Paper text:
Overall, based on structural and sequence analyses, the sialic acid–binding pockets in GD-BatCoV, HKU25-BatCoV, and Japan-BatCoV show considerable conservation compared to MERS-CoV. However, Loop-N2 in these S-proteins is incompletely resolved, suggesting that further investigation is needed to confirm their sialic acid–binding capacity. To explore potential interactions between HKU25-BatCoV-RBD and hDPP4, we docked the HKU25-BatCoV-RBD onto the MERS-CoV-RBD:hDPP4 complex. In contrast, only V554HKU25 (corresponding to V555MERS) is maintained as hydrophobic in HKU25-BatCoV-RBD. Therefore, the lack of these hydrophobic interactions suggests that HKU25-BatCoV is unlikely to bind hDPP4 in the same mode as MERS-CoV, GD-BatCoV, SE-PangolinCoV, and HKU4-BatCoV. Of note, a recent preprint reports that HKU25-CoV binds ACE2 as the receptor.
Spike (S) protein is the major viral surface glycoprotein of MERS-CoV and forms homotrimers. For the MERS-CoV S-trimer, NTD is known to mediate cell adsorption by binding sialic acid, while RBD is known to bind the human dipeptidyl peptidase 4 (hDPP4) as the entry receptor. The S2 subunit mediates membrane fusion and exhibits a higher level of sequence conservation among CoVs.
Author numbering:
A (entry chain C): 343 to 373, 378 to 682, 703 to 740, 747 to 782
B (entry chain A): 50 to 91, 104 to 141, 145 to 222, 227 to 342
C (entry chain A): 783 to 852, 858 to 907, 916 to 946, 956 to 1167, 1177 to 1218
D (entry chain C): 1027 to 1167, 1177 to 1218
E (entry chain B): 1027 to 1075
Write the structure that this text describes.
């Protein structure tokens, strides 16, 4: 013997209770239709500064910040051969198929033989004096090799700061790079280092910078530290592979549809609405950071609501094996014989204007309504019997009711 | 904060008819800030204060209250009457400082972020440049040098496009310049608000002329690509050369340092912070 | 003295799958491993709501009255149903209408709440819970209360003025004082009743209890809605952000944190709803005991009804309970009088006497009521024969007639 | 619930300790066993707190059962509806699986007769003397005493009646005077 | 019980914030600190209830 939970709301109840037989009672049973894609006209991110000139070293890293542009990720991944990547709170497939509000890229010439010194908890010279990765946004660290046919010009060698200190009569005072900032010894080290353990000195600030040399490889090896942000700008940075054609919302209003509103992905219910909030920001939020409205290009304001489920109830009667479905607190227009009741639309009950005394009601349906098995299920109304009325007498004394005959009740 | 003074509006989003707690760069309550006044010249020699000899620290940034008392009549600073207009501050921010050959004022080594109002207050020009001092009579490589200024002669001007710039070029040689941005300003007399802050994504400039012009809420309008940490700023002394019959007043401005504080913001139905 | 006793709590059922996964199809595959916990949560909530419905039916069956009667100088306008009604309910009283207008309750919506929330609490459909309707609509509860307002094995049809006369004669005041001061009694009664509408303010204990009873349900619903914003160590509290920002070997790890966190929070919601549900059932038993003692009869027990000597009390409907109006007898002035333990004659067998519900006060010896000073002649109706005591007053000049021969 | 909280995996690869030991490694065995340890300790804390609420509830309800025995079982209760329905006569108590089970015998009427009653009766003497009944009424069909719970017209007597003060609500008798009102 | 709930490690390397700060690196400190934060906020909810 088996039960297909799907077919009927009573099954669902039997599968939830995990028993072929369930008692009589009023139980509760468990209860992406389009696309609204809105995007800008289009703009290309300028990746030429990294792909054109000579790459800099670890201490003198160059940083590009991109906002409100589209970039060809496939072309960039075709230009470079990735040796090793390690991401934090994000994955590169989500970088391929998503949009972010900003994109910060730090790139420099870096040998793959020193790839362990760029790691998360490393204590080498690179982390102490050259570059410290910042872990406060979703970020990735990519080490890639540039082929010989690329437009980049290989440097003379690989340089990095070995130590950077200052001061006298207190010993050496080590100066250590900050999280995501340049080293204090940058002005001494801009010229670079030519021999191993070559030391440069500045007489004004009494700062000393010492470097180290790695031989230049056959193919230029470069390192990337990218970082992404969410919910910062009105526009967004999106890969060209994630761009889809625009769709309007003049139809499909009032249904749970997926939206891509200038890079904002989610699902919800859109309704035409009176304009609130500031138009320029474009996105109206609530206290909890849920998208409340969207000031659209069409010109209309659309108050966004998360798509919901209509609550369900089952009025099961075990002796007659008859059930009815209550749609909780929703009118019968939406459900579209259903009958509108004080507890919502219900299908499976007939209305016959029958009244049942309190104590005769075995299936109470919310308010003063009942389902009786008189087989078919009928909608009733609970009404208690009014007390016996003893009429007063206009005469000198009063009228009293004294018991004749009795019984014993336990 | 009951008038929402110096409040940077959240970027990329808006709120409507709610109150929520925000942590960000906000000024302290009851902070008087720093008074800076721009006066009128003697047409004689220029009249300035010692706004250049002071060493200010950028920290997290600052907010400038521009245009207060832009309709009141006060005695002139140089003749202690006349109506008072609104003047725009000129800034000079850099990461590294040094000294001139005469050890006077502040020099900014390497790349310097210079913000100058342009076109007699009709536009704002922002550039990162390395400025190399000039060797002349009163220019900063001489013993006769006192301070560097920028001057606008309202007589005789306005419309010269490079008046603030030619005033800056009088003192420095602009070489190695990464960028030059220009933003147009409509001529008004409303009290405004301006902010500068540096993040990991560059230098952000905020203003109340973008949105909430009649109030005080500041909105982002420029994200400058400066990634070296700014450590010092100086207010360039600005002087106006006009006749004795033409002397007119100029509103002072206040600079309040920003701090990492928690604020409770009240939003209206229109979305503003009041 | 107004007293509120809480009868119900808000019946809330939770759709566990909708609450945990929010309709994201990748979450249901992970939740199928945690299959039985959602069913156990639903079964526990269903049992709690069923027990609360049984308690409501038992209370409203206990407070019904077998016979009723169809008002002197007493003004019972407030207690009775308004002749022209400002209330959508035809059985509600005026004072019940005032009490329900001064307490603010969010309208859950039982007939068309979904359409009202879709046009232009409404968080039930979003979060995944649902407020079940109460067992009786407020019209039927007001009908029960109004039938009780009309009101042993025998029923006497004496009017309200006669009932007040007998109830205030039973506490110590003699018949002569009630006959002489009838107009003042009616004026004092009507005036006290007229302060009931002005008593529905703050810094009142019963109204504060009503407000806290209203606020407890809202606090429970707010906790249930706000536990969905907890990240539980994940990168976001939204399933969509996890699914669109991460990759499948790491998505199931982070979606799970949300699954395990939300089920534990739901379990703690079920546990605190069980404590509140059994707490509200013992109150209903108390509320009926109070109806059967203070309302259906005159209570001789001190302090159970309101302050002072109890005379009569009325009960109306309140948000999630019943609201009482205990009319008591309090004195404002008093006189110090010399009383006697008893009086004995000078016969050869000494016969001694003692008062009933009164004192033998002086200014020779007179009888007065225990709750009002009115010196009356000592009679056989006022006094009971008692054995002699040495602290009794041996009176020989003027002897009351019950001690004569 | 206590037995079924052991089936929760708590984010681990399995809810069984042996499966974790036989499928994982001494670096990551303790990372998953500690998830079972922390999850089960929190589950035990929720069970203990639930039992403390249930124990203090049954301890107060056992005091209610002792008061119900002392009022309904050991004596006849004069309260209205405290024990059962109708007028209380006698009660019995037996043992239940987790408490005490009571059987409250009550006097309930079935039929009734409307009768004309009197507040009291007074004679025609120059000092008026008045009487009032106890545990009953003065009914007709001239005036007879009857019980307060059963209709049975009986002759008025001293036993049936108590004296009272003169009231204007009382009936004044001239024709037939009961023996307690005789001079 | 309220004082003894602060001695629970909740799966971290230590129950002290100071030990987590001086023994781990910023990729992994917020992973263990959030474990202590979520554990103590849940134990505070049980104390209030
Ligand atoms: C800020 O500006 C100062 C001044 O221009 C910069 O210092 C200069 O840095 C360059 C390159 O780092 C130095 O040039 C080098 O000179 C040596 C010979 O001394 C030569 O062998 C090298 O090939 C290279 O050309 C220059 O001497 C040095 N000048 C001074 C006065 O320090 C500084 O680097 C700038 N800071 C930043 C962060 O760019
Ligand atoms: C100095 O005086 C001038 C006089 O014009 C002030 O300009 C005026 O400022 C008020 C500020 O409330 C402006 O009123 C606004 O009008 C807009 C419609 O344009 C309305 O939507 C706003 O709600 C508000 O009522 C007024 O328009 C403006 N005058 C002009 C000609 O633009 C200036 O604000 C004064 N400055 C100071 C510092 O007191
Ligand atoms: C992203 O870059 C790739 C390669 O640089 C582009 O692919 C080329 O598209 C043109 C036109 O369709 C073809 O003729 C080439 O053969 C393609 N090359 C490769 C290697 O696929 C692609 O079109 C770019 N995407 C966008 C949106 O411009
Ligand atoms: C800053 O302070 C210095 C003093 O150290 C001022 O330098 C003086 O300038 C005047 C005017 O040219 C000369 O007569 C003095 O000889 C200078 N003194 C020294 C010690 O150099 C400088 O003018 C001040 N800058 C201001 C006020 O902007
Ligand atoms: C390799 C020499 C090992 C010497 C071992 C003796 C003592 C070392 C004590 C602690 C080791 C910390 C350094 C671990 C490697 C850092 C990797 C890097 O630098 O990026
Ligand atoms: C530290 O102590 C050493 C030796 O006692 C001394 O040479 C040095 O100057 C001291 N440094 C500081 C900063 O106190
Ligand atoms: C997308 O829209 C463009 C119009 O710019 C159209 O040419 C193209 O065919 C569309 N593609 C799809 C898949 O709808
Ligand atoms: C949306 O509503 C606005 C005002 O409420 C109205 O001006 C506009 O025409 C409406 N648009 C549609 C498509 O109904
Ligand atoms: C049932 O039918 C009667 C008669 O038409 C009607 O008055 C009543 O409202 C109906 N009840 C419901 C719940 O529709
Ligand atoms: C219930 O019955 C009473 C009389 O017995 C009547 O006045 C009232 O209208 C009835 N109510 C319903 C809902 O049937
Ligand atoms: C009481 O009623 C029962 C049935 O209702 C009947 O059998 C019995 O005779 C009656 N007794 C009297 C005294 O009327
Ligand atoms: C704004 O909020 C207040 C209270 O928070 C409310 O009374 C008012 O109706 C709201 N206004 C609008 C337009 O929603
Ligand atoms: C500027 O001059 C004033 C003169 O009162 C003086 O108080 C102030 O310290 C000076 N500022 C600097 C930086 O020297
Ligand atoms: C510039 O010279 C003055 C002269 O005393 C000195 O106080 C100041 O510290 C110097 N500043 C720099 C940046 O060297
Ligand atoms: C500036 O200060 C430095 C600091 O020692 C000094 O060597 C130099 O001589 C000073 N120059 C002048 C012009 O005062
Ligand atoms: C500044 O630029 C002018 C332009 O011709 C040049 O003559 C002068 O020598 C420059 N000054 C310095 C200090 O380089
Ligand atoms: C700024 O104003 C000038 C002068 O009216 C005009 O030539 C220029 O195009 C404007 N720029 C922008 C961006 O509006
Ligand atoms: C009884 O009190 C109500 C309260 O407003 C009043 O309207 C009514 O007139 C009063 N009754 C009499 C008879 O005065
Ligand atoms: C009354 O007489 C009794 C009998 O001797 C005596 O004990 C008592 O003290 C007397 N009381 C007074 C007040 O005289
Ligand atoms: C006598 O009895 C009648 C009976 O109705 C009553 O009305 C009246 O008040 C009594 N007293 C007098 C003094 O008539």
């Amino acid at each position: 013997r088996a039960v297909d939970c799907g077919h009927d709301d009573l099954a669902q109840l039997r599968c939830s209770y995990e028993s072929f037989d369930v008692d009589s009672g009023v139980y509760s049973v468990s209860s992406p239709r389009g696309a609204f894609i809105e995007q800008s006209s289009g703009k290309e991110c300028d990746f030429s500064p990294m792909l054109t000139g000579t790459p800099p070293q670890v201490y003198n890293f160059r940083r590009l910040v991109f906002t409100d542009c589209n970039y060809n990720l496939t072309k960039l991944l075709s230009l470079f051969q990735v040796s090793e990547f390690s991401c934090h709170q994000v994955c590169p497939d989500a970088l391929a198929s998503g949009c972010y509000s900003s994109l910060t890229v730090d790139y420099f010439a870096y040998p793959t033989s020193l790839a362990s010194y760029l790691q998360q908890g490393s204590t080498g010279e690179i982390t102490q004096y050259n570059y410290k990765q910042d872990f406060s946004n979703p970020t990735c660290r990519i080490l890639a090799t540039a082929p010989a046919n690329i437009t980049l010009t290989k440097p003379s060698n690989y340089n990095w700061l070995t130590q950077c200190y200052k001061g006298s009569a207190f010993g050496n005072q080590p100066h250590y790079v900050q999280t995501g900032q340049y080293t204090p010894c940058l002005g001494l080290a801009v010229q670079g280092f030519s021999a191993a353990y070559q030391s440069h000195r500045d007489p004004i600030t009494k700062l000393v910078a010492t470097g180290n040399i790695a031989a230049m490889t056959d193919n230029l090896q470069m390192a990337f530290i990218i970082s992404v942000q969410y919910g910062t700008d009105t526009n967004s940075v999106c890969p060209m592979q994630a761009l889809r054609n625009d769709t309007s919302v003049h139809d499909k209003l009032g249904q749970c549809i997926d939206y891509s509103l200038y890079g904002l992905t989610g699902r919800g219910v859109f309704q035409n609405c009176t304009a609130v909030g500031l138009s320029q920001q474009r996105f109206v939020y609530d206290g909890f950071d849920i998208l409340t409205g969207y000031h659209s290009d069409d010109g209309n304001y659309y108050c966004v609501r998360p798509c919901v489920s209509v609550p369900l109830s089952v009025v099961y009667d075990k002796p007659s094996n008859n059930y009815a479905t209550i749609f909780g607190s929703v009118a019968c227009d939406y459900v579209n014989t259903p009958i509108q009741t004080a507890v919502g639309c219900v299908i499976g009950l007939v209305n016959s204007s029958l009244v049942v005394d309190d104590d005769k009601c075995t299936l109470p349906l919310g308010q003063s309504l009942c389902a009786v098995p008189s087989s078919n299920l009928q909608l009733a109304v609970i009404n208690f019997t009014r007390p016996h009325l003893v009429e007063a007498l206009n005469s000198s004394g009063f009228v009293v009711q004294i018991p004749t005959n009795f019984s014993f009740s336990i | 904060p009951a008038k929402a003074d110096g409040i940077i509006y959240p970027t990329g989003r808006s709120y409507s008819n709610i109150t929520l707690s925000y942590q960000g760069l906000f000024p302290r309550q009851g902070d008087q800030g720093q008074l800076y006044l721009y006066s009128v010249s003697h047409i004689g020699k220029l009249f300035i204060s010692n706004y250049t000899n002071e060493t200010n620290t950028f920290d997290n940034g600052f907010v400038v209250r521009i245009g207060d008392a832009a309709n009141s009549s006060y005695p002139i600073i140089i003749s202690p009457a006349r109506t008072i207009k609104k003047i725009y501050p000129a800034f000079m921010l850099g990461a590294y400082i040094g000294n001139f050959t005469n050890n006077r004022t502040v020099r900014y080594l390497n790349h310097t972020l210079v913000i100058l109002p342009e076109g007699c207050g009709t536009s704002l020009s922002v550039f990162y440049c390395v400025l190399i001092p000039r060797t002349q009579h009163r220019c900063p490589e001489d013993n006769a040098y006192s301070s560097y200024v920028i001057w606008e002669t309202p007589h005789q001007d306005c419309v010269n496009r490079n008046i603030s710039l030619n005033a800056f070029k009088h003192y420095f040689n602009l070489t190695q310049c990464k960028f030059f941005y220009s933003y147009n300003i409509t001529e008004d007399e409303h009290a405004e608000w301006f902010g500068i802050t540096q993040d990991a994504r560059g230098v952000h400039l905020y203003s109340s002329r973008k949105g909430d012009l009649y109030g005080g809420n500041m909105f982002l309008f420029a994200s400058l690509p400066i990634y070296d940490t700014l450590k010092y700023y100086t207010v360039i002394p600005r002087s106006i050369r006009s006749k004795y019959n033409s002397r007119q007043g100029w509103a002072a401005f206040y600079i309040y340092k920003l701090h990492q504080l928690t604020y409770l913001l009240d939003f209206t139905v229109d979305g503003y912070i009041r | 003295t107004q007293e509120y006793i809480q009868t119900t709590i808000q019946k809330v059922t939770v759709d566990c799958k909708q609450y945990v996964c929010n309709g994201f199809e990748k979450c249901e595959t992970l939740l199928r491993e945690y299959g039985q916990f959602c069913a156990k949560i639903n079964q526990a909530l269903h049992g709690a709501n069923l027990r609360q419905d049984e308690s409501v039916a038992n209370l409203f069956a206990n407070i019904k009255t077998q016979t009723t009667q169809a008002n002197g100088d007493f003004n019972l306008t407030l207690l009775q149903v308004p002749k022209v009604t400002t209330s959508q309910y035809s059985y509600r009283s005026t004072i019940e209408d005032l009490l329900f207008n001064k307490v603010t309750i969010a309208d859950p919506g039982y007939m068309q709440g979904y359409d009202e929330c879709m046009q232009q609490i409404c968080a039930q459909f979003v979060a995944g819970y649902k407020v079940l309707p109460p067992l009786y609509d407020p019209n039927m509860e007001a009908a029960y209360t109004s039938s009780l307002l009309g009101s042993l094995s025998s029923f006497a049809a004496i009017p309200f003025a006669q009932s007040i006369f007998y109830r205030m004669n039973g506490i110590g005041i003699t018949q002569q004082v009630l006959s002489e001061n009838q107009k003042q009694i009616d004026k004092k009664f009507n005036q006290a009743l007229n302060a009931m509408q002005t008593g529905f303010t703050t810094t009142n204990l019963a109204f504060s209890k009503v407000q806290d009873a209203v606020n407890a349900n809202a606090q429970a619903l707010a906790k249930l809605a706000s536990e969905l914003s907890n990240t539980f160590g994940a990168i976001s509290s939204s399933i969509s952000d996890i699914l669109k920002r991460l990759c499948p070997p790491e998505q199931e790890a982070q979606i799970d944190r949300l699954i395990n966190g939300r089920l534990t929070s739901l379990n703690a919601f079920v546990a605190q709803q069980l404590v509140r549900s059994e707490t509200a059932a013992r109150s209903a038993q108390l509320a009926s005991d109070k109806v059967n003692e203070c309302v259906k009869s005159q209570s001789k027990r001190n302090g159970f009804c309101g302050s002072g000597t109890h005379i009569v009390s009325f009960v109306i409907n309140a948000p999630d309970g019943l609201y009482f109006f205990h009319v008591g007898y309090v004195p404002t002035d008093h006189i110090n009088a010399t009383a006697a333990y008893g009086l004995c004659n000078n016969d050869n067998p000494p016969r001694c006497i003692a008062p009933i519900d009164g004192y033998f006060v002086r200014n020779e010896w007179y009888y007065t009521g225990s709750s009002y000073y009115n010196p009356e002649p000592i009679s056989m109706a006022n006094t009971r024969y008692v054995s002699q005591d040495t602290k009794f007053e041996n009176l020989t000049t003027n002897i009351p007639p019950p001690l004569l021969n």
